[PDB]
Symmetry: D2
Subunit: 130 residues, 4 copies
């Protein structure tokens, strides 16, 4: 399961998205240490604040299943450049993923940006601060 | 899959909860028309606003899998009376579940409150309002 | 400061709304025991989950100023019937407002629905449950 | 209104915080181009996902008043090092503040970290992506 394969997973996950308000579909694919893949997509709501992002859907699914050891996360959307996870998502990622987990960002035209969880949100607010 | 059985599902789902901040674990079990059960649990974050509830975890998992037809939702937590879904959850439920879906609320002592999605949040803000 | 006057406050507050994504402007006016009025409006974000509602804006402003004793809350939007506070808002209202506070809901055509905070979200999840 | 003076504003704002759940109070002070200061503090809820951060409180207050031109934002909390805005906050900041706005982070022991809005969340998901 290389990153190109994980990207295809995210691309398929994107088609399951429920985004009738923004018409902006996003897909994510989370790869565990054991090699299992969890797909995620954004799910919207008439009350915009309740919208859930693809990255969080994938992470929530994994964690709810008992999987907490990850190695890579791929995210895709039809944006100009590689899709940029929103701040809230980066925060969730920084909590549920270890600092060296690889985050692969891409769009629907082959643009690819790779970075670690640490780089995604340097010095992220954490439990240690509490 | 009667409600008592769906409640046991929620009780097991509760044990998967990631809630180190509140120490308040919640579990949810969503039953589809076809009879499939999706388990959910709350997942917290150092940044409290990023916490995700059990009900939403279950619904997000189902929807991401292509399942959008539900018949019942069970929720459980160690509260004095039947657990009360927070407002945000009721909003998500009102969007992803049809009005007559049955919502079963309970705690860890056999208290049970049953109501429909409509009753859970009467006249909920919806797409029609937009 | 009767309810009709508080409604006009909410109607003016609505014009300050920053909602370029939904194009759905909402206004709110919070009246304290001492008679002070706090205006609120929805403020959106490209990342939909970060959108903040009018009711919350008004309540956050008041509380940040040291005002925590309220008597009435008015909310207005261009909806078919009286605007319905989203679940997340009802949850915040239920925490920051005592159960006797009067909530006045209306649209831009004279439709008015009045109810207490308790009625807005009966048996709302609260600190007592934690 | 230099940064040291804006920091004192944030320190005072912090005392207004409503955070009975985390017992973690945060303060923020937003300075407009015209020199006006808006104070903010975190406001919690029994349902953790509804918690609002200091930075957002200050920004929401300003915007609701018609002020949309800012020059600096100060944030303070009792953390080991300068307080780190959570991802959700950085996202809101990136939307409501121009990229040149200065963000001043500090704790209660004189540690100070200064950076621009762009640096706070480089390549932040924005309307252009939609
Ligand atoms: O973090 C990324 C960027 C944002 N989108 C979302 C949520 C929402 O339904 C839509 C518009 O913000 O894209 C995601 O799903 N993931
Ligand atoms: O709607 C219900 C009530 C609230 N809890 C949550 C989220 C959070 O982790 C914790 C404290 O609010 O319980 C749920 O998970 N579901
Ligand atoms: O609770 C009410 C209903 C929802 N709207 C919002 C937030 C968002 O910007 C827009 C669409 O959901 O209306 C409010 O501002 N208040
Ligand atoms: O972005 C910063 C970091 C997080 N805190 C919050 C919200 C919540 O009440 C508490 C614990 O997450 O600190 C803030 O208020 N601002
Ligand atoms: Zn996101
Ligand atoms: Zn909830
Ligand atoms: Zn709302
Ligand atoms: Zn924050």
């Amino acid at each position: 399961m290389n990153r190109q394969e994980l990207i295809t997973e995210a691309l398929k996950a994107r088609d399951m998205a429920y985004a009738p308000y923004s018409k902006f579909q996003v897909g994510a694919a989370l790869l565990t240490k054991d090699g299992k893949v969890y797909r995620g997509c954004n799910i919207e709501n008439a009350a915009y604040s309740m919208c859930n992002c693809a990255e969080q859907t994938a992470l929530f699914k994994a964690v709810s299943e008992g999987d907490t050891e990850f190695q890579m996360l791929a995210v895709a959307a039809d944006t100009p450049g590689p899709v940029s996870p929103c701040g809230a998502c980066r925060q969730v990622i920084s909590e549920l993923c270890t600092k060296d987990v690889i985050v692969v960002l891409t769009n629907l035209q082959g643009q690819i940006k790779e970075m670690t969880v640490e780089e995604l949100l340097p010095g992220a607010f954490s439990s240690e601060d509490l």
